[PDB]
Amino acid sequence: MVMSLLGHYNNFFFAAHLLDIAMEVKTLRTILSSVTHNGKQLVMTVGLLAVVVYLYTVVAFNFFRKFYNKSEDEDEPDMKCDDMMTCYLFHMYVGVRAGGGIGDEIEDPAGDEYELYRVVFDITFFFFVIVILLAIIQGLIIDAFGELRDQQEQVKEDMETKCFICGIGSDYFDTTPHGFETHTLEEHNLANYM
Amino acid sequence: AESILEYFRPYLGRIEIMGASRRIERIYFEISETNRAQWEMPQVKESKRQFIFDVVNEGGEAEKMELFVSFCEDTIFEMQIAAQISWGELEVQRVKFLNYLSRNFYTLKYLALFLAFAINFILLFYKVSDSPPNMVYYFLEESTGYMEPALWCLSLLHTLVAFLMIIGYNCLKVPLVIFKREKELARKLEFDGLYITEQPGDDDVKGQWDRLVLNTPSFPSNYWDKFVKRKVLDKHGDIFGRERIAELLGMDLASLEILTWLMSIDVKYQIWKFGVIFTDNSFLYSGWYMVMSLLGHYNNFFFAAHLLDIAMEVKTLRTILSSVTHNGKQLVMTVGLLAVVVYLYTVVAFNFFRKFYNKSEDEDEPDMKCDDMMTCYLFHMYVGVRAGGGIGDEIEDPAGDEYELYRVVFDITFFFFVIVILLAIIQGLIIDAFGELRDQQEQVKEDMETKCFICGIGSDYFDTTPHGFETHTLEEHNLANYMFFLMYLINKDETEHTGQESYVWKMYQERCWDFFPAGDCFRKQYEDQLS
Amino acid sequence: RQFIFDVVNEGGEAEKMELFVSFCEDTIFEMQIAAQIS
Amino acid sequence: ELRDQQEQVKEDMETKCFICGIGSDYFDTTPHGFETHTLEEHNLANYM
Ligand SMILES: Nc1ncnc2c1ncn2[C@@H]1O[C@H](COP(=O)(O)OP(=O)(O)OP(=O)(O)O)[C@@H](O)[C@H]1O
Ligand SMILES: Nc1ncnc2c1ncn2[C@@H]1O[C@H](COP(=O)(O)OP(=O)(O)OP(=O)(O)O)[C@@H](O)[C@H]1O
Ligand SMILES: Nc1ncnc2c1ncn2[C@@H]1O[C@H](COP(=O)(O)OP(=O)(O)OP(=O)(O)O)[C@@H](O)[C@H]1O
Ligand SMILES: CNC(=O)c1cc(Cl)cc(C)c1NC(=O)c1cc(Br)nn1-c1ncccc1Cl
Ligand SMILES: Cn1c(=O)c2c(ncn2C)n(C)c1=O
Ligand SMILES: [Ca+2]
Ligand SMILES: [Zn+2]
Ligand SMILES: [Zn+2]
Ligand SMILES: [Zn+2]
């Protein structure tokens, strides 16, 4: 209701109401439940994916501060490592979102100069931050899925097979023809105990 | 008699042992308030949960029972320590201080964790300058009454707290360590003859660092039986010279004889002891944390190493990272292959496609990254692996004839393998590792939700009567009670032991764990009759 | 359907029965409301 | 898939006998039952 009142102040606020297209139609709710199921894990995963980009920020600084720099004009400034957080930023922006990590937006060791340090650096970066971490993320959700399904199946079976009121199983009730279908539809029915 | 039979409900216990007449019999006894009071504190409760978890999903299924008795024996020690924490004149202050640093050890840990984030937030403001306020570093903030003075001040507090956790660990979590270590030794010598008949056997390094204490005159220090050295002389004392086992167990000549500090110190025991700890994986982590806090005074960016605890033991991070540490040798192994394949490609390219390479533009174009199988190997592990279509995106373009259909095959093969197959396998392993932990956990829980620990009977038989598997698992065969018995009988002054409490005692002192039900239970035995 | 689902895969196994009685007590109220609107 | 197969194998064993087919239950009624009917009586190496 409040967003529908804001829709009269600026009509683009009516775009907020399309978020119901996620709330309770069963295919969208079961899909989004795989993401919600598993929260503190994920919100923590992302947490690590920040303390693992802060450390690649620090190191660089101390040593590789020249191998950086993103300008072209002779009077080249735009030094994204000569100030406070800019690097932490440059590492959470340009970095994380790429293919080979920082190694694709920072000069090129090539010309000697600690060559075998910026190689190690980059390869260690991309490998962790892009395989390991981003991988773990897809990992959690897939599991969360399998998880819901397992619960559901357990439910159904525990039922297809045994009684609610009492606890006897199908066997001791199926020794006779159509048995577990009587001791659960006539005798110990549920609706009737109500 | 309901009032009475209720006031005394928390101070009674029902066991269900089987012995003598080959029949099930019930035992009743009394438990003090303090005996039960030191059981519901959170530290012991979490120990129960962890022990139950790692005995159903590892190699038990027969010898699980002796592990349970071993579980009781160490919680016996644990509860004694907790009771003790709740010139000349300075000794009263020092015992009160050591009891203080160990009484709240987990608050010192949270306070060190908060100071790591407080220092690292202040490090985001640094800045480099071409001249002073070449290569001059400044704290680059508005003066505030903050920044530089607070960065100086917090570096002392983090080092003080990282030092106090060494003392806090050494006076709380190391006693039990040295304990679970003497028992072992004094349990091999007698009922096996370790050094009296066989021999460590090299491989067992542990079983060697510990050939130093045997002779020590305080071997059974943190261990109840200060007589072990005399039960081995009495046993393996004939088949082996009574004057030969009268050495590798100290008691030198004792066979016949059957301020402070600096003044009395078994130099040789202390040595042994020290060794035992510089190898505990929890002590080495605590030592590293302190060392990095000292390096934090040489260059303040070393305090960024302490943010790695944000992975070590908060439960969402630990369960997430545990999916990566499971399947270790697998992963590393995979990468190994991903380095042989990109080599079986280096060898190839070279021989033929060495011109299709080259990464220069100047007329005098050199930068030929294929004039050495070394550089080629790098160019293939650098530019290559990390891309979208593999080498095919950083190496000219077949197009112009020249083996066109060879560099096509090359690239497409390289690509498909190294980027689908391999990188895929990696994500594969971790996901599985996940499913793996969950399965174990579920197994644990269920095996429990459903069956008994002491014996092995299942729910069914029990659930025949209303709420069956909640009594035979909450009264009779309870677990906590098969433990309070021990502590009880240990106090009961012998001469006043009953009949059943003397069958168990003699069976405890001789390690014959056959007094546990295992397979049966009153209800079953006395079925027909009534119970 | 929803009640049956969330009593087998959570912490029942003993006290499930009082939940069932609690289930009946609220559907008792529900049916009374529907009568008052028709 | 491979893991499932492996687990099945192990368990089918941790739990039941090879020569005959009786399970752990009918054997564990007594103390350490199965660990006997699979290490003394119906051992396998011995039928060899
Ligand atoms: N009291 C009971 N005791 C044992 N089993 C029961 C009991 N009530 C239901 N069941 C189990 O659930 C099944 C019957 O559920 P039913 O399909 O009637 O519920 P429903 O989905 O509301 O019905 P409908 O499909 O008509 O909507 C039976 O197979 C039975 O095994
Ligand atoms: N001696 C036993 N024999 C059979 N089952 C047992 C035994 N001890 C515990 N259990 C099983 O474990 C459950 C009781 O565990 P309980 O929850 O009391 O441990 P806890 O988690 O330490 O307790 P709390 O939840 O109060 O911390 C019961 O459902 C029971 O089936
Ligand atoms: N004949 C049998 N009948 C039933 N179970 C058997 C039989 N043989 C082996 N087993 C099962 O396998 C297990 C014994 O296998 P064992 O570990 O001895 O094989 P192994 O791995 O060759 O031995 P080791 O571990 O010494 O190499 C027992 O737990 C038992 O249940
Ligand atoms: C497994 N690491 C350790 O042993 C450890 C060792 C030392 Cl010397 C210092 C700290 C802060 C350590 N880290 C923790 O001890 C810790 C990190 C997180 Br996140 N939570 N957490 C914790 N766990 C329980 C109670 C209080 C806390 Cl603070
Ligand atoms: C003397 N004694 C014992 O005999 C004992 C014990 N714990 C188990 N036993 C058997 N403790 C702590 C003990 O002091
Ligand atoms: Ca007496
Ligand atoms: Zn029924
Ligand atoms: Zn039991
Ligand atoms: Zn058999």
Curated annotation (Swiss-Prot), chain B:
Post-translational modification: The N-terminus is blocked. Channel activity is modulated by phosphorylation.
Residues recorded as bearing Phosphotyrosine in the entry: 357
Motif segment (Selectivity filter): 388-394
Topological domains annotated Cytoplasmic: 170-273, 315-329, 435-531
Effect on the protein upon substituting residue 391 to T: Loss of channel activation by halothane and caffeine due to Ca(2+) store depletion, probably due to constant Ca(2+) leakage through the mutant channel
Residues annotated for Ca(2+) binding in this entry: 495
Transmembrane feature ranges: 105-125, 149-169, 274-296, 298-314, 330-350, 414-434
Intramembrane segments: 374-393
Subcellular location field: Sarcoplasmic reticulum membrane
Tissues/organs with expression: Detected in skeletal muscle (at protein level). Fast- or slow-twitch skeletal muscle.
Positions on the Lumenal side per record topology: 297, 351-373, 394-413
Annotated effect of mutating residue 319 to I: Decreases threshold for channel activation by K(+), caffeine and 4-chloro-m-cresol. Decreases inhibition by Mg(2+)
Phosphoserine sites (modified residues): 360
Binding partners and assembly: Homotetramer. Can also form heterotetramers with RYR2. Identified in a complex composed of RYR1, PDE4D, PKA, FKBP1A and protein phosphatase 1 (PP1). Repeated very high-level exercise decreases interaction with PDE4D and protein phosphatase 1 (PP1). Interacts with CALM; CALM with bound calcium inhibits the RYR1 channel activity. Interacts with S100A1. Interacts with FKBP1A; this stabilizes the closed conformation of the channel. Interacts with CACNA1S; interaction with CACNA1S is important for activation of the RYR1 channel. Interacts with CACNB1.
Misc. remarks from the entry: Binding of [3H]ryanodine indicates that the heterozygous channel is activated by Ca(2+) concentrations 4-fold lower than normal. Single-cell analysis of cotransfected cells shows a significantly increased resting cytoplasmic Ca(2+) level and a significantly reduced luminal Ca(2+) level.
Domains (record comment): The calcium release channel activity resides in the C-terminal region while the remaining part of the protein constitutes the 'foot' structure spanning the junctional gap between the sarcoplasmic reticulum (SR) and the T-tubule. Pore opening is mediated via the cytoplasmic calcium-binding domains that mediate a small rotation of the channel-forming transmembrane regions that then leads to channel opening.
Similarity comment: family membership: Belongs to the ryanodine receptor (TC 1.A.3.1) family. RYR1 subfamily.
Record function comment: Cytosolic calcium-activated calcium channel that mediates the release of Ca(2+) from the sarcoplasmic reticulum into the cytosol and thereby plays a key role in triggering muscle contraction following depolarization of T-tubules. Repeated very high-level exercise increases the open probability of the channel and leads to Ca(2+) leaking into the cytoplasm. Can also mediate the release of Ca(2+) from intracellular stores in neurons, and may thereby promote prolonged Ca(2+) signaling in the brain. Required for normal embryonic development of muscle fibers and skeletal muscle.
Protein name: Ryanodine receptor 1
